[PDB]
Design a protein around this ligand. Sequence first.
Ligand SMILES: CC(=O)N[C@@H]1[C@@H](O)[C@H](O[C@@H]2O[C@H](CO[C@H]3O[C@H](CO)[C@@H](O)[C@H](O)[C@@H]3O[C@@H]3O[C@H](CO)[C@@H](O[C@@H]4O[C@H](CO)[C@H](O)[C@H](O)[C@H]4O)[C@H](O)[C@H]3NC(C)=O)[C@@H](O)[C@H](O[C@H]3O[C@H](CO)[C@@H](O)[C@H](O)[C@@H]3O[C@@H]3O[C@H](CO)[C@@H](O[C@@H]4O[C@H](CO)[C@H](O)[C@H](O)[C@H]4O)[C@H](O)[C@H]3NC(C)=O)[C@@H]2O)[C@@H](CO)O[C@H]1O
Ligand SMILES: [Ca+2]
Length: 787
Amino acid sequence: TDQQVGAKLVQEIREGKRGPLYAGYFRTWHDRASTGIDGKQQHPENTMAEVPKEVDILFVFHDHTASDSPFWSELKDSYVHKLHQQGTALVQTIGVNELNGRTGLSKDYPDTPEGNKALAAAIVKAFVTDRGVDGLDIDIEHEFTNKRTPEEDARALNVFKEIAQLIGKNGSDKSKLLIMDTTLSVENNPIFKGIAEDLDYLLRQYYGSQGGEAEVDTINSDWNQYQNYIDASQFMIGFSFFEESASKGNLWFDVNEYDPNNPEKGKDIEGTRAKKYAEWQPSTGGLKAGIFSYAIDRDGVAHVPSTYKNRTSTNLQRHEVDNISHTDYTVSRKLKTLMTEDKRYDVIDQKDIPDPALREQIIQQVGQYKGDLERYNKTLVLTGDKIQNLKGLEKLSKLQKLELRQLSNVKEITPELLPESMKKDAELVMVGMTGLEKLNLSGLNRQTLDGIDVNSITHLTSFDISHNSLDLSEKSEDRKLLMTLMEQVSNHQKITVKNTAFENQKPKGYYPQTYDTKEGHYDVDNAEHDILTDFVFGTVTKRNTFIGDEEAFAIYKEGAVDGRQYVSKDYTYEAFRKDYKGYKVHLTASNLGETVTSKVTATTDETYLVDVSDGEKVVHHMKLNIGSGAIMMENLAKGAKVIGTSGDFEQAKKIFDGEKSDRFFTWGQTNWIAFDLGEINLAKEWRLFNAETNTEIKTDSSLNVAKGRLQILKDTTIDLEKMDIKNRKEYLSNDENWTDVAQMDDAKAIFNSKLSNVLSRYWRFCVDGGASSYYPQYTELQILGQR
Ligand SMILES: CC(=O)N[C@@H]1[C@@H](O)[C@H](O[C@@H]2O[C@H](CO[C@H]3O[C@H](CO)[C@@H](O)[C@H](O)[C@@H]3O[C@@H]3O[C@H](CO)[C@@H](O[C@@H]4O[C@H](CO)[C@H](O)[C@H](O)[C@H]4O)[C@H](O)[C@H]3NC(C)=O)[C@@H](O)[C@H](O[C@H]3O[C@H](CO)[C@@H](O)[C@H](O)[C@@H]3O[C@@H]3O[C@H](CO)[C@@H](O[C@@H]4O[C@H](CO)[C@H](O)[C@H](O)[C@H]4O)[C@H](O)[C@H]3NC(C)=O)[C@@H]2O)[C@@H](CO)O[C@H]1O
Ligand SMILES: [Ca+2]
């Protein structure tokens, strides 16, 4: 049956039985059975029927072919059968607009759960079942003209998942492939992030140069993120053949240029981008799935010369290679041969990994190809008593976690059996190692022994953990672990330095995670002090052993187990300690005034709140008292009700929030705001944040308030809410009803001064002039006191 042939091809593709794959996009209007809207034949020169066996998957790429064309029944009842016989699968390609509302059956279904689920079945019946093919390929490109909305990409991804529940590896009908082709990186491809686990392949178009000396910069950088969503064996990269009459913007130069002296040049793969994609392999994960070509019906046509690369549809510059001609698919077949003869696709054999039980678990976990070995960068779990020998493990040189579970017949672990990534902090877990006789981890810069199950190593006869980065100090848990290893050796043998080697550690230095002083003190000694020196200092080991300064390190360097000193003699404090570069100290005085400085001078009774930062986060918070300290003032003006202003009433209310992301000005050089602190407390200072402190607009200092007066309602015996709106406003505007408590005659960015213990419920601040002719502005006002 023709549906069982197709089902079995898809299963042998999906299970990786084909080696490196080669795919091609065949443009429907270049099949000879294709007819346009007027019912006339478009091009007689080529036909899908002649696509060679070297093409593993053939993508029906549809345009210009009318819906009543003979092409469609010809494909269904003739092309599918001829191509299946040689082992070629047919896949239908549709654009994303057929899923997101913009085109086709998408326009006839609501954007609801039951609506998108009915749409999905309608797409699978219209584009897969009714056309006879072996799967579906969703084309997702950058739309530079009218971007897709977040709601459209959300719908396309919900429809795609409903499709993936019908066909593909997770679908009801696993005899069909489900594929995506794209031009978008992961950061720009939310549909890919959502559907990736349901894809057989991702086809990444990379026509033309992708940057850098080898022109593959974008391929390498993009693979670094695709590898978190798909396996390398699902990754296909694409080049394009030369399309006739291609204009600027569609001229990739992926194949060789026309040569008037050699009519066959277009079939020569030497020097082409196509050949480079054929040989390109990812740095991590595995070997790629293969390559694909756009416009496979143009296989072998020489590219139009570089001199023509500026032609456009209005500026036609026709060349000989724009003619249509019969192709015999030689370039395709050379590229497929180059890939299947590349020795990185030879299968891992016993010469790579001698132990059969080890070889089987590796192939099962990292892939089947020799080339997969040195690229794989994830986790390897090895289990059971059938593994006798770890030879070959060292070829997994990017392995990120090695996990040895109950390997009861392994006798030897040495650096030379281990991945080279073990020297750069790959994880190493080994449990139930009851047969282990030699445990050599020397020279691997291991920072702890965590994950090594030392209680289980009951047959140990020697170990070497020397030349690592361990902290074997008295309380380190790595010294407990070392002690068990030494006891294991001793049950079989007299302990010697060689069979229990652990010297020459060089433990790395880290920042302490917390600091002890929550409340510091200084006398009023009229001297300068450094808060980082005195309170936020030092370095820990990975096991949180604190070393405060260079003399604490010298004692540390003399640590010994049984009189054997385990720290390298030439390890220096400079190489161990953290330098604290870029650390910054934020101080808040009892003022509520703020400064950034690690130095304080103890001239008077004060209290700062200290926030220590490393350039990114707050590492430490403490209070510092100088002398007997000082009580912390509050901003009593916080949230003060505005009761009157010569400006706008709701711009005025923003000078009493907490922020500087706003500005208050009026049309002119003078204004006033009158406010009510509500309760009636004691005020000692005031602070004005001038125009240039604005955190929402870069504001220059020429807009700063330069003259002003802060005032108190002079008569306390008056009910301001018994006056009516208009009288109230003119009372508040009349200067003889206000007493000054503070002047300002400098256009500082932040202005602060003290008040003679002012007790007032009602206040008014007046801008009397600006730093320039511009309207003066300011962002925030504070009245600082107690209660
Ligand atoms: C995976 C990939 O490679 N992606 C893109 C490639 O697409 C791209 O190659 C180009 O592809 C063009 C077609 O693009 C279609 O797909 C993309 C991507 O999905 C869409 O963005 C695009 O909009 C196209 O989508 C198609 O839309 C139609 C309409 O909505 C759909 O048809 C609908 O189908 C439904 C369901 O079946 C329903 O039936 C509707 O009724 C129906 O309307 C269709 O399904 C959909 N297809 C897909 C797959 O989604 C190509 O056009 C372009 O090739 C042209 O240009 C090159 C040179 O640059 C030529 O070599 C080539 O032959 C072709 O030229 C055109 O030829 C026709 C036939 O002769 C000309 O028509 C005649 O021209 C005369 C000229 O005087 C008259 O005007 C006459 O009236 C007319 O009949 C036509 O004018 C020619 N046009 C030009 C410009 O020359 C190319 O292959 C590549 C770019 O390299 O980029 C990849 O990223
Ligand atoms: Ca404000």
